Amino acid sequence: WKQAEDIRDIYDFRDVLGTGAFSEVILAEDKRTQKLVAIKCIAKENEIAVLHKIKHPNIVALDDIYESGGHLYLIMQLVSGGELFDRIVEKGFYTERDASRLIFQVLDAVKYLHDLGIVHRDLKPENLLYYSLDEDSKIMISDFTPGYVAPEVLAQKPYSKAVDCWSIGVIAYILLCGYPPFYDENDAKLFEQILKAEYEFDSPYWDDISDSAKDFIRHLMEKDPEKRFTCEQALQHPWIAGDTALDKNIHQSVSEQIKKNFA
Ligand SMILES: Nc1ncnc2c1ncn2[C@@H]1O[C@H](COP(=O)(O)OP(=O)(O)OP(=O)(O)O)[C@@H](O)[C@H]1O
Numbered sequence: 001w002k003q004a005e006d007i008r009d010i011y012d013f014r015d016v017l018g019t020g021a022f023s024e025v026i027l028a029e030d031k032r033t034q035k036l037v038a039i040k041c042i043a044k045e046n047e048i049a050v051l052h053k054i055k056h057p058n059i060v061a062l063d064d065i066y067e068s069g070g071h072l073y074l075i076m077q078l079v080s081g082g083e084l085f086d087r088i089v090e091k092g093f094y095t096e097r098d099a100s101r102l103i104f105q106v107l108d109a110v111k112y113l114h115d116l117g118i119v120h121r122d123l124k125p126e127n128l129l130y131y132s133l134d135e136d137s138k139i140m141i142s143d144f145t146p147g148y149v150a151p152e153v154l155a156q157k158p159y160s161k162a163v164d165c166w167s168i169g170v171i172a173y174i175l176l177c178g179y180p181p182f183y184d185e186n187d188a189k190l191f192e193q194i195l196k197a198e199y200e201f202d203s204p205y206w207d208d209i210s211d212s213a214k215d216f217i218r219h220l221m222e223k224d225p226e227k228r229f230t231c232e233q234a235l236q237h238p239w240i241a242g243d244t245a246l247d248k249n250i251h252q253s254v255s256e257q258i259k260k261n262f263a
Contacts, residue, residue, distance in 0.1 A: 001065050010030070011039060014028060062077075079130065096209060169221035182199060
């Protein structure tokens, strides 16, 4: 937790890697070591001690913090593989089993955070980055929305780590069909959809998806936080731990739905 006079004495700021709600992420070179990093530039408009304890293969490591008069600079492990949806769209062949492998990694990382007492609360397909352009690259959670936001939260009821399990279910849903489980033109009706947790595995998009996958999703996307699968429980579900995920090429439809619905 140092301070920088000119942050630029220490980092060479090159290109914007991406942009958040009210912060940008920048590719930089550590001038001291020549190591490439990703720097999160947060305007100034106890948890950082915890953020350094986070060390997991599927979580973007925070490597340092420096502060200037105007901003906070979070020096992050650089990830070079691009966003999750982009790879899926650009990918030639895509299966339920690829979806399951990604979900496994997210569950693994999320449970590890829950054991540190960290609740993500903003798990989104955007937060999910490939580690390299390697075809076999692992995925990683970058961060430390309607749709993705669990019913409890939107009901302004008491919420636990179970909120993150909801988000994971929403992501799994999108990963298998390319569109969000909740959508309406009127925000009011959308929120009511989310609050009632009423969604469908609607045909034709879901015809070729396994029942085990549907079972898996039903259990994460469960309105009652006390009924909802936890990370540990989702990990041991057959679709994740066994051999139920199918091998059919679902790329075309999912890819087209993603283009219709995101970026
Ligand atoms: N470590 C990283 N390496 C490479 N690119 C990153 C890294 N972290 C973030 N990015 C890029 O920045 C984008 C924005 O992510 P974040 O900055 O994670 O968005 P956010 O969830 O809106 O956070 P915030 O609300 O604090 O701005 C990502 O989608 C990705 O393209």
